[PDB]
Amino acid sequence: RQWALEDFEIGRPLGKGKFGNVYLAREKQSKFILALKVLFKAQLEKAGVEHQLRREVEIQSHLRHPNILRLYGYFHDATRVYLILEYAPLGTVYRELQKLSKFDEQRTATYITELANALSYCHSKRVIHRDIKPENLLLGSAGELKIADTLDYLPPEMIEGRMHDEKVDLWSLGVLCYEFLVGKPPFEANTYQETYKRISRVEFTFPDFVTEGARDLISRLLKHNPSQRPMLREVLEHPWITANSS
Numbered sequence: 001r002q003w004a005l006e007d008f009e010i011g012r013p014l015g016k017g018k019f020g021n022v023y024l025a026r027e028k029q030s031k032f033i034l035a036l037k038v039l040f041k042a043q044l045e046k047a048g049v050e051h052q053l054r055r056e057v058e059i060q061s062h063l064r065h066p067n068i069l070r071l072y073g074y075f076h077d078a079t080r081v082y083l084i085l086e087y088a089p090l091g092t093v094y095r096e097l098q099k100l101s102k103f104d105e106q107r108t109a110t111y112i113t114e115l116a117n118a119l120s121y122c123h124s125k126r127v128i129h130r131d132i133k134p135e136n137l138l139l140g141s142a143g144e145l146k147i148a149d150t151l152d153y154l155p156p157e158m159i160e161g162r163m164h165d166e167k168v169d170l171w172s173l174g175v176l177c178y179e180f181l182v183g184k185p186p187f188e189a190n191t192y193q194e195t196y197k198r199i200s201r202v203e204f205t206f207p208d209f210v211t212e213g214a215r216d217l218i219s220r221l222l223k224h225n226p227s228q229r230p231m232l233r234e235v236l237e238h239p240w241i242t243a244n245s246s
């Protein structure tokens with residue numbers, strides 16, 4: 001049921017990332033194309049993120065959803081840890097955003113609709129990974145979204161140190177929707193300290209080209225008090241979503 005690094009042909013690099021790169025790979029026996037994530041135990045141990053990692057790993061392994069990057073397996077050698085992941089051929093949403101500068105309401109709503117589903121599944125399954133950047137959002141063959149696995153995407157309750165629950169996801173959707181439409185996250189600043197202040201105060205403005213249908217949803221998502229954020233079902237049922245989703 002386990003493996004080795006001898007069973008893979010390593011291709012081009014896909015990203016630098018965190019504690020090691022990710023390579024395009026191919027299982028020799030089956031010719032299965034996949035993404036191989038490499039992480040150094042030593043570099044892992046220096047931040048001690050070994051329990052949290054393997055905890056995160058074991059759970060994702062059993063998760064099955066179109067909008068979540070499949071994890072097939074894992075193993076280690078001596079100096080590093082290998083993750084066998086679903087290969088998303090169309091890259092990250094962040095790059096597409098970089099190329100397209102910004103998204104239309106059609107693509108945005110469709111993305112948000114895809115995400116809201118995934119988080120609902122993630123919530124029901126009682127799994128939590130709270131923070132979602134476009135850097136960790138991947139695209140499938142059909143252009144479908146893929147969730148894989150930093151202050152700008154954190155909710156006020158998290159940076160303040162207060163308690164938090166499933167409502168922090170709603171915040172993320174709000175930040176992403178805005179960024180998708182504008183090309184910049186709402187609370188972007190040239191300073192960590194300034195971003196912090198703006199998240200805690202919820203200081204943001206809409207560019208003129210943003211429709212009041214989108215302003216509404218975003219405004220209702222980016223509430224400081226988590227209790228006043230809508231349920232996920234409400235997002236999917238939102239008129240601006242329905243009108244522009246796919």
Ligand SMILES: CC(=O)N[C@H]1CCN(c2c(Cl)cnc3[nH]c(-c4cn(C)nc4C)nc23)C1
Pocket residue numbers: 014015016017018019020021022035037085086087088089090091092095135136138148
């Ligand atoms: C450290 C870490 O998590 N790196 C992750 C980022 C996305 N990533 C991918 C993962 Cl985990 C799986 N498949 C990918 N495909 C791509 C890609 C990027 N471009 C520009 N074109 C393609 C195709 N990236 C991935 C590796």
